[PDB]
Amino acid sequence: LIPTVIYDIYSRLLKDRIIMLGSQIDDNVANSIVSQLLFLQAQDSEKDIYLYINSPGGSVTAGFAIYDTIQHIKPDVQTICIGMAASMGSFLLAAGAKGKRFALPNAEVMIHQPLGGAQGQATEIEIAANHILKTREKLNRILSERTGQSIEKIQKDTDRDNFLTAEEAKEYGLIDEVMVP
Amino acid sequence: LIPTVIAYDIYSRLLKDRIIMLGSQIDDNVANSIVSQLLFLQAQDSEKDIYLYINSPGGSVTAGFAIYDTIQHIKPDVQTICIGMAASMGSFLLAAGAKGKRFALPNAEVMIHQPLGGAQGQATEIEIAANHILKTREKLNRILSERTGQSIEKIQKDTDRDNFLTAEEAKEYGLIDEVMVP
Amino acid sequence: LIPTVIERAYDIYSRLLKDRIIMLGSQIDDNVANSIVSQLLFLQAQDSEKDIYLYINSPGGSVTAGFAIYDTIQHIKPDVQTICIGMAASMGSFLLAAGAKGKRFALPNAEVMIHQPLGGAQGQATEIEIAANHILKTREKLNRILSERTGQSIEKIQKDTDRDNFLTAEEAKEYGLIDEVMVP
Amino acid sequence: LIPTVIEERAYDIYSRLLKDRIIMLGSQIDDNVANSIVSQLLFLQAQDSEKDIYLYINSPGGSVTAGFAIYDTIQHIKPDVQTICIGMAASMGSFLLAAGAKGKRFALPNAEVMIHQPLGGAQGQATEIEIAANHILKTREKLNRILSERTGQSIEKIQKDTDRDNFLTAEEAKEYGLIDEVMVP
Amino acid sequence: IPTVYDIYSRLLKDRIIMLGSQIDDNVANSIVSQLLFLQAQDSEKDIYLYINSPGGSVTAGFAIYDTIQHIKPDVQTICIGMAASMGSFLLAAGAKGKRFALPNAEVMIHQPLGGAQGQATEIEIAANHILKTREKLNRILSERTGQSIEKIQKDTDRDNFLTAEEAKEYGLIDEVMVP
Amino acid sequence: IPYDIYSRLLKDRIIMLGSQIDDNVANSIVSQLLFLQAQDSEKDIYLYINSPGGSVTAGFAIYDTIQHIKPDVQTICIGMAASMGSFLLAAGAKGKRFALPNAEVMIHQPLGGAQGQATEIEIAANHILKTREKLNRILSERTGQSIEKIQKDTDRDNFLTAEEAKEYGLIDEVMVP
Amino acid sequence: IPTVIETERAYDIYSRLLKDRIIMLGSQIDDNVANSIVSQLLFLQAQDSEKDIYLYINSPGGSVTAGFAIYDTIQHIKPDVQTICIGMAASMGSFLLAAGAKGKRFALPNAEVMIHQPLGGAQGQATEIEIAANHILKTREKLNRILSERTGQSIEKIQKDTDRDNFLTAEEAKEYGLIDEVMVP
Amino acid sequence: LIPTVIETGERAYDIYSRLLKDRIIMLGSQIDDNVANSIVSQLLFLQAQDSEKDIYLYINSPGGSVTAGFAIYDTIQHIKPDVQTICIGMAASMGSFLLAAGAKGKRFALPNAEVMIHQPLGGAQGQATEIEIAANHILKTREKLNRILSERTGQSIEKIQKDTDRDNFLTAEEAKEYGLIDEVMVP
Amino acid sequence: LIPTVIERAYDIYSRLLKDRIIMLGSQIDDNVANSIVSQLLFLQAQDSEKDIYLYINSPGGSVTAGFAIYDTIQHIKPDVQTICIGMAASMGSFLLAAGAKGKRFALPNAEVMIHQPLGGAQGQATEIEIAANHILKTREKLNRILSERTGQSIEKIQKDTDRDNFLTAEEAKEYGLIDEVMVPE
Numbered sequence A: 001l002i003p004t005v006i007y008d009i010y011s012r013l014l015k016d017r018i019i020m021l022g023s024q025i026d027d028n029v030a031n032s033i034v035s036q037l038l039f040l041q042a043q044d045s046e047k048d049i050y051l052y053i054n055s056p057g058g059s060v061t062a063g064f065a066i067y068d069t070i071q072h073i074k075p076d077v078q079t080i081c082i083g084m085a086a087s088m089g090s091f092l093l094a095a096g097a098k099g100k101r102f103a104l105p106n107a108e109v110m111i112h113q114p115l116g117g118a119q120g121q122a123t124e125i126e127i128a129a130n131h132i133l134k135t136r137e138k139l140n141r142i143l144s145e146r147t148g149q150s151i152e153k154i155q156k157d158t159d160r161d162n163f164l165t166a167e168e169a170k171e172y173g174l175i176d177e178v179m180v181p
Numbered sequence B: 001l002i003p004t005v006i007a008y009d010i011y012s013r014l015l016k017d018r019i020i021m022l023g024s025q026i027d028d029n030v031a032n033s034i035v036s037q038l039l040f041l042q043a044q045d046s047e048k049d050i051y052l053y054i055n056s057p058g059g060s061v062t063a064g065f066a067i068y069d070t071i072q073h074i075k076p077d078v079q080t081i082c083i084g085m086a087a088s089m090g091s092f093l094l095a096a097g098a099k100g101k102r103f104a105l106p107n108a109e110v111m112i113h114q115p116l117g118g119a120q121g122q123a124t125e126i127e128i129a130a131n132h133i134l135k136t137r138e139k140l141n142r143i144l145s146e147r148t149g150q151s152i153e154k155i156q157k158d159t160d161r162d163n164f165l166t167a168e169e170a171k172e173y174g175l176i177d178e179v180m181v182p
Numbered sequence C: 001l002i003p004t005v006i007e008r009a010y011d012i013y014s015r016l017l018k019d020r021i022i023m024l025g026s027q028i029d030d031n032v033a034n035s036i037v038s039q040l041l042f043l044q045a046q047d048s049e050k051d052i053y054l055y056i057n058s059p060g061g062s063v064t065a066g067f068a069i070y071d072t073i074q075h076i077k078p079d080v081q082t083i084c085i086g087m088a089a090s091m092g093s094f095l096l097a098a099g100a101k102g103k104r105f106a107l108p109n110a111e112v113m114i115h116q117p118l119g120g121a122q123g124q125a126t127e128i129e130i131a132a133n134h135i136l137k138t139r140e141k142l143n144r145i146l147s148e149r150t151g152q153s154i155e156k157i158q159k160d161t162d163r164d165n166f167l168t169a170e171e172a173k174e175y176g177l178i179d180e181v182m183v184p
Numbered sequence D: 001l002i003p004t005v006i007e008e009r010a011y012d013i014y015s016r017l018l019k020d021r022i023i024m025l026g027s028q029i030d031d032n033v034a035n036s037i038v039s040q041l042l043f044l045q046a047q048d049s050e051k052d053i054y055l056y057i058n059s060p061g062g063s064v065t066a067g068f069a070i071y072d073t074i075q076h077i078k079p080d081v082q083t084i085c086i087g088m089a090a091s092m093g094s095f096l097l098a099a100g101a102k103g104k105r106f107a108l109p110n111a112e113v114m115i116h117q118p119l120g121g122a123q124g125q126a127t128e129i130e131i132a133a134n135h136i137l138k139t140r141e142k143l144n145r146i147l148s149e150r151t152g153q154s155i156e157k158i159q160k161d162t163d164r165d166n167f168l169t170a171e172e173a174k175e176y177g178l179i180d181e182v183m184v185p
Numbered sequence E: 001i002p003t004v005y006d007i008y009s010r011l012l013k014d015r016i017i018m019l020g021s022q023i024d025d026n027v028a029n030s031i032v033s034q035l036l037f038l039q040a041q042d043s044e045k046d047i048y049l050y051i052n053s054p055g056g057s058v059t060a061g062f063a064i065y066d067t068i069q070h071i072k073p074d075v076q077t078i079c080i081g082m083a084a085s086m087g088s089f090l091l092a093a094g095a096k097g098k099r100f101a102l103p104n105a106e107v108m109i110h111q112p113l114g115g116a117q118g119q120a121t122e123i124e125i126a127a128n129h130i131l132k133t134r135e136k137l138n139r140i141l142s143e144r145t146g147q148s149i150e151k152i153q154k155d156t157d158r159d160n161f162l163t164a165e166e167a168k169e170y171g172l173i174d175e176v177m178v179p
Numbered sequence F: 001i002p003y004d005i006y007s008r009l010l011k012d013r014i015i016m017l018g019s020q021i022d023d024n025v026a027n028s029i030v031s032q033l034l035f036l037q038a039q040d041s042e043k044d045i046y047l048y049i050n051s052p053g054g055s056v057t058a059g060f061a062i063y064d065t066i067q068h069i070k071p072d073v074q075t076i077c078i079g080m081a082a083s084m085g086s087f088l089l090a091a092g093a094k095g096k097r098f099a100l101p102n103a104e105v106m107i108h109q110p111l112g113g114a115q116g117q118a119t120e121i122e123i124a125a126n127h128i129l130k131t132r133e134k135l136n137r138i139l140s141e142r143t144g145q146s147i148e149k150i151q152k153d154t155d156r157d158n159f160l161t162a163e164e165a166k167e168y169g170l171i172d173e174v175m176v177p
Numbered sequence G: 001i002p003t004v005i006e007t008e009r010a011y012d013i014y015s016r017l018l019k020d021r022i023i024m025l026g027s028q029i030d031d032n033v034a035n036s037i038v039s040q041l042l043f044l045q046a047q048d049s050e051k052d053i054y055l056y057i058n059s060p061g062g063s064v065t066a067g068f069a070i071y072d073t074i075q076h077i078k079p080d081v082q083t084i085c086i087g088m089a090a091s092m093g094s095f096l097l098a099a100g101a102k103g104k105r106f107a108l109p110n111a112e113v114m115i116h117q118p119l120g121g122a123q124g125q126a127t128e129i130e131i132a133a134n135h136i137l138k139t140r141e142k143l144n145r146i147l148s149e150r151t152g153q154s155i156e157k158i159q160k161d162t163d164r165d166n167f168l169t170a171e172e173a174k175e176y177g178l179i180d181e182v183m184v185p
Numbered sequence H: 001l002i003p004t005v006i007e008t009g010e011r012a013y014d015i016y017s018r019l020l021k022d023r024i025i026m027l028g029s030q031i032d033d034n035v036a037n038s039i040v041s042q043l044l045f046l047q048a049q050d051s052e053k054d055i056y057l058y059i060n061s062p063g064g065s066v067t068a069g070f071a072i073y074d075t076i077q078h079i080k081p082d083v084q085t086i087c088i089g090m091a092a093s094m095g096s097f098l099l100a101a102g103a104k105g106k107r108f109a110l111p112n113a114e115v116m117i118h119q120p121l122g123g124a125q126g127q128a129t130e131i132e133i134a135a136n137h138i139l140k141t142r143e144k145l146n147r148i149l150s151e152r153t154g155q156s157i158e159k160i161q162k163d164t165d166r167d168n169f170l171t172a173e174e175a176k177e178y179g180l181i182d183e184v185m186v187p
Numbered sequence I: 001l002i003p004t005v006i007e008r009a010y011d012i013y014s015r016l017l018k019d020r021i022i023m024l025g026s027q028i029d030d031n032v033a034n035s036i037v038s039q040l041l042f043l044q045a046q047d048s049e050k051d052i053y054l055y056i057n058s059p060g061g062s063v064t065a066g067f068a069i070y071d072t073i074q075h076i077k078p079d080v081q082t083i084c085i086g087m088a089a090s091m092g093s094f095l096l097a098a099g100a101k102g103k104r105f106a107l108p109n110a111e112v113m114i115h116q117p118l119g120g121a122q123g124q125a126t127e128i129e130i131a132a133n134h135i136l137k138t139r140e141k142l143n144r145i146l147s148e149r150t151g152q153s154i155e156k157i158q159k160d161t162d163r164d165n166f167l168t169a170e171e172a173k174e175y176g177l178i179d180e181v182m183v184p185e
């Protein structure tokens, strides 16, 4: 079900510097998106890139592969939330170039604390706990820098699933504008 | 770039610019592909740098060594860049890049730990498997010592359990040379 | 399908236990060992001098469970006769050899098999090492005791248990695993 | 549905038969079944070392070593063990049928007797496969020798006749020497 | 299963055996044991074998059959519900003149079922065996019914369902018991 | 199960058919009927029926045993009698077939299956059609309804109230409190 | 599996290597893999009967008969087949490593070589088990004889050294005669 | 992982298609109806391209369906070109039957190739008369196989019957001595 | 693994279709019938007078799918030759017999099997009756057509298809299912 134009549709959008993050974030998705960002910078280091985000989130490290690549490259990466940006999806939405982070009016943004698991000996559980707590501090610190909210507020607001409308995401500082029709 | 995902594909397009993407678990298929890419790139140009991007949770030690030995065998320098995560054999390969040209992005995670395995059967079969995995660990630790400047004893202690490092800590450890700031 | 006998109602195994006969007729696991240990303890308390008879038809099983039985045999005062019927393999044959000296038997077509212990290990290199060291120590312990019980050297036992080694009743006697083959 | 009978002493039907020195081998032969039958034989000898025991056999066979537990116990005890094949005695079942006291091995007229070579398996290294092969071949020689002694047939004839599944009528089993008489009504 | 003795044990006290299931080795062993017990209790009084069974193992069925013929007491057979395959063979095996069915009971006769897998010569052995088994069954059925072996062969080629009255006409039973 | 309770009821000539009808259930109920007749050939027996039905031949084992024995067998539908269960409800002694007011009675044609060659399918079809004729004929005799009406009314699942079951002739009375 | 374009002729990476007479044995050896590698060898010799072929080996081994399909095709064709162990060559993988043209068998320094006896299975009648045992023993003799010829070690030493899993470093494989050189960086 | 090769007009072929261009057919799997249909089609194509040039049938196969095997067998005998057979790795059961079916003088094996012959395998379930029909059919199939093997090898039907009673493994050299092949190709 | 031939590029089956050869080499289901029907339609449109060749190696399958093929064969103008290679069973043998008169063949070792249709039915008595009537009518339809194609009576066809009936190529010719056995050049 992916149509061709005479390029598959996604390839055609990539030709106009549009990248589609339209799934769960895992290592494959991150590798693809990183590669696309790298390609687009090499084609033109000055023109904006557009990152569409409809994602329930996923791997934090995979998300950081994308995040760090966005910040590393020279072109501004605009982010546009369409449908849903949850968890690491909303983290990436907030990571777009300042002034160029958007959502459409009925798009949903969700923020929460990271999820994980650990099994085995007490000291193994301790290591996993310490690691996921450090990961949360890292996420919260960056979210604070990107939103203008304090680390303490971010901690409280991500304790449980916290659903935001597009307008609430703007007020929060996760995006800069809601794109009206 | 004919399709993003199935120089027709995005990875093939990057390979045209001497960029290899290690973006998965390391098994024999992945190693064979990466080895083949390294071999191809050396034949195209034996002097220009190659760039190995690493986002990997690790995997097979022997598959990892296929990649490792091919890197050291070819003439071109292979730069390594950790993005996202390099764990286990992934971090071993990160450390194996050309000296001075091993990088991580600031929020990338590096994890080191001892090798994992199994053994089943008779006592003497278990012994053989134990001796083999212990020798494999010594080989890994010795090479990691040479690549990082850390002692074998420190590497042994620090890999006893899962040990997570920030990019900056990986630099201090000697696993990479520089953190690439924006 | 375990039948009853009346003389007071007893299942057949309970009836044999009344005459100091214990039946080891399965794989050796912790349940079986606990039952057999309990039976040995009961019989010693009933009479600390009269012989006990341990029937063995077993493919072996857990080494530690086997040692629960082994140590209980050696600990109690009564002699425990061992009789191999059908098969005694692995820890089964170890228990056969552990019966009171002069009172270890097999019937003529019974099979005895000796081999090295089996096991497994999964996880980190150091975990595999610990498991390997443990199973090697367990083998040394087994071999040392088998040497003491058979009169064979530790070196011969090591060589003869490297692979599955099947013995006839008569060969088991020649080896020193039993004292006599019971002819009809 | 195993019924009870009351003599008030209550017995399941098999226990009631055991009181009259009748043992029922009515299933596949495994270690549990052998242990039970061995225990019954031992009990009956202790009750009476001179009166006959009756071993009913309706069995497709099973474990050879379990079968030998039963076989050796039969030969070891003092009482004669009569064997009666009812329904089917196959493989180790027919071996046990042939092992009853000479002159006291029977089948009912429509009972089926089947003889064949032992079955097994082996997995692993070449030398492990070799050990398993040598073992099962020795087991077959042991079975065939005893069958020769019990039937009066040569080892060579037994080898040939057990190469594949060989089904015998009760009358053919008698002619073969596996049993002594067919019990007519 | 209610108590009074469980109900089946209570019936066994009056020389009634209930074959109310598929015939396998367990069922045969139980029924054989019951027949043996009842003969020892009284070698002259009739036994009653109730049959509601879809059939099952031929060799298990023959364990029961041969035990019936071996013992001294007459074994009456009564088909209630269904007697199919080896069930109907056992119905026909009751003492002559004392084989019954209730009016709505169903009797079914058919050829034996089986399987064979492996080498050509193994398939041949299995085929020869099941054909011999069918000849043995048909011969005995002929003796018990008065029908020819050829008629039995033809009539058992496929599933053949009989009413109680048809079973009587066939010679599988002697009488239909009217209320 | 808390004599267990069912055994206690059997002592007062009450049999409980409280499940699907299969060969085990039929064998038990047949045995109970036989026992009760031998205890007393003249006193009524009471057959409680709460059953979704089941095997037709098993049902007929019960049916024929009821008609064969001397004592009257009263039937009482409590909860549900469907298919073969409603057939057995209708088989109780005339004048002594009951249901409680909220009990459900369901009648329908027999269900079955056939697989294999065309001639095997034909044999199975002929057999189940003959079985249906047998059931319908007996139901006609027990209810007073014609075979044609029974055929039409059992074509699909047909649920009846206790009162409708009485009007149909499947039972004689609805027991009011 | 990435593509490479020549300016547009498209090759996957393995096809591109095959253009330079490089065959990649990078998996378990089964019939599919053997058929592919045999076909590649046949193609390569037809293209050029004199230029060397390069067989990369990173394999845990697999089917013996599939391995022999590859082995016999290597020896049959005119071009020398160089072997290079990268990562691991175990079992039939190490047999194929040793089968490369004399003087042209290599490993990279951290590559692992493992040798052991063949593995198998057998189930069924005693005589079937015997046939399977005889077959796997003959297969082992065949493997060991060829390994002796290729390494210079005696058949007796090969038998002893393959009794259990025997892991060798690249340097030890050279000393053993399984390869001719370790390629140092 | 089936590789591509590009000829110099340029043409792209998978490796098997490239071999087919030189009249080489690869029987490299279990023999079922799909495999037989493909091989039959290849034989038919090659005969139409050239009715006189030899065809080469590579055999590495554990065997499989007898009727599928006979589809291949009969097509080999029907076409005009000689079909050479070469056993590489293993030819077992119907695989070894097809090996023996190659043109006389042009049946080969490489030295370490394994050849196995045995009686056909099957199954039957159901009524006694159904089992009988299946038994008769598989016995007739065995007679047919054995008769043809006798004609192809020069061995008697009686010897073939005895030698295929159980799994019988042959070296390439033993297969030649048996008459299943004509030559072992030595390096 | 369906190979390519270059004139554009054709898979092997497409190449044969260019020469008016259709390969029925599987179980007959709706997909297979649709493909074969489409091929027949294509070939008639290409040339309404030249023969078509239908190779048949099939265990049979769906009767209605088989009739899709059958009716399309009879509807089109070109003669459709049928050639049985390997096996034609059930609906496969029905289609073999449906080829143009005088142009139905089998190779000498090909197997032909005829039997009655198979099916199933579940549910209410009247549903079972409907399914039984339907499959019986389907059998009458098949037998009538087979009678017309073979020259055998409907009564003989009924008797001969009661159970699985295996025919040699020569027996199929004698029966009238085919016209000739193609013997080797």
Ligand SMILES: CC[C@H](C)[C@H]1C(=O)N([C@H](C)c2cccc3ccccc23)C[C@@H]2N(C(=O)NCCCC(F)(F)F)CCC(=O)N12
Pocket: C015, C016, C017, C018, C019, C021, C022, C053, C054, C055, C081, C083, C085, D038, D042, D043, D044, D045, D046, D047, D073, D076, D077
């Ligand atoms: C055949 C037995 C011969 C009379 C003898 C013997 O060989 N064994 C051996 C040691 C034995 C032990 C355990 C299980 C056996 C099973 C079969 C044969 C001998 C067994 C035990 C046996 N003993 C008993 O049989 N005691 C009576 C037990 C009665 C009952 F419990 F009901 F079984 C101990 C004294 C003895 O002389 N023997």
Ligand SMILES: CC[C@H](C)[C@H]1C(=O)N([C@H](C)c2cccc3ccccc23)C[C@@H]2N(C(=O)NCCCC(F)(F)F)CCC(=O)N12
Pocket: D016, D017, D018, D020, D022, D054, D055, D056, D082, D084, D086, E032, E033, E036, E037, E038, E039, E040, E067, E070, E071
């Ligand atoms: C019908 C039996 C004929 C009178 C005879 C006989 O043939 N057998 C054979 C050998 C036999 C043994 C075991 C199981 C049998 C089952 C069915 C038929 C004979 C069987 C044993 C049988 N015996 C008994 O039946 N003893 C009483 C047991 C009664 C109870 F235990 F309650 F079942 C021993 C004395 C004897 O004369 N016979």
Ligand SMILES: CC[C@H](C)[C@H]1C(=O)N([C@H](C)c2cccc3ccccc23)C[C@@H]2N(C(=O)NCCCC(F)(F)F)CCC(=O)N12
Pocket: E010, E011, E012, E014, E016, E048, E049, E050, E076, E078, E080, F030, F031, F034, F035, F036, F038, F039, F065, F068, F069, F070
């Ligand atoms: C009023 C005709 C009856 C019932 C008659 C009869 O027909 N049968 C037949 C043969 C029978 C046997 C087995 C199961 C039966 C089930 C239902 C009906 C008859 C059955 C058995 C029945 N018999 C008994 O009922 N004995 C009393 C003990 C019964 C119990 F309490 F259950 F133990 C034996 C002889 C007899 O006269 N009949």
Ligand SMILES: CC[C@H](C)[C@H]1C(=O)N([C@H](C)c2cccc3ccccc23)C[C@@H]2N(C(=O)NCCCC(F)(F)F)CCC(=O)N12
Pocket: B035, B036, B039, B040, B041, B042, B043, B070, B073, B074, G016, G017, G018, G020, G022, G054, G055, G056, G082, G084, G086
């Ligand atoms: C690093 C390679 C060194 C320069 C050398 C070598 O060591 N090998 C070995 C034998 C080799 C073979 C097969 C796979 C290998 C993989 C990694 C390293 C060496 C390999 C073969 C290798 N050769 C090539 O690399 N040819 C060009 C292949 C181009 C393309 F196909 F695109 F990859 C042959 C001539 C040679 O000098 N070498």
Ligand SMILES: CC[C@H](C)[C@H]1C(=O)N([C@H](C)c2cccc3ccccc23)C[C@@H]2N(C(=O)NCCCC(F)(F)F)CCC(=O)N12
Pocket: G038, G042, G043, G044, G046, G047, G073, G076, G077, H018, H019, H020, H022, H024, H056, H057, H058, H084, H086, H088, H185
């Ligand atoms: C140059 C000696 C060979 C190797 C010789 C040979 O032994 N075989 C045998 C019969 C053969 C057939 C099929 C597959 C084989 C695979 C491996 C070895 C021999 C094979 C056929 C082989 N032939 C070819 O190699 N033709 C060219 C192949 C081109 C391409 F398709 F590209 F692979 C036919 C002429 C011939 O002399 N031989």
Ligand SMILES: CC[C@H](C)[C@H]1C(=O)N([C@H](C)c2cccc3ccccc23)C[C@@H]2N(C(=O)NCCCC(F)(F)F)CCC(=O)N12
Pocket: I037, I038, I041, I042, I043, I044, I045, I046, I072, I075, I076
């Ligand atoms: C045998 C066909 C007879 C000549 C005729 C016909 O009966 N049909 C019917 C309606 C038809 C339609 C769709 C599928 C059919 C499949 C089999 C037979 C008839 C079919 C349509 C069919 N038509 C075509 O066959 N057109 C050319 C075919 C194109 C291609 F297949 F690609 F080559 C349209 C006009 C016409 O004359 N007919």
Ligand SMILES: [Mg+2]
Pocket: A070, A071, A072, A073, A074, A075, A076, A077, A097
């Ligand atoms: Mg940027």
Ligand SMILES: [Mg+2]
Pocket: B071, B072, B073, B074, B075, B076, B077, B078, B098
């Ligand atoms: Mg380098």
Ligand SMILES: [Mg+2]
Pocket: C073, C074, C075, C076, C077, C078, C079, C080, C100
């Ligand atoms: Mg003691």
Ligand SMILES: [Mg+2]
Pocket: D074, D075, D076, D077, D078, D079, D080, D081, D101
């Ligand atoms: Mg005795």
Ligand SMILES: [Mg+2]
Pocket: E068, E069, E070, E071, E072, E073, E074, E075, E095
């Ligand atoms: Mg009698």
Ligand SMILES: [Mg+2]
Pocket: F066, F067, F068, F069, F070, F071, F072, F073, F093
């Ligand atoms: Mg009444």
Ligand SMILES: [Mg+2]
Pocket: G074, G075, G076, G077, G078, G079, G080, G081, G101
């Ligand atoms: Mg060569």
Ligand SMILES: [Mg+2]
Pocket: G166, G167, G168
């Ligand atoms: Mg070593």
Ligand SMILES: [Mg+2]
Pocket: H076, H077, H078, H079, H080, H081, H082, H083, H103
């Ligand atoms: Mg030819």
Ligand SMILES: [Mg+2]
Pocket: I073, I074, I075, I076, I077, I078, I079, I080, I100
């Ligand atoms: Mg036409």
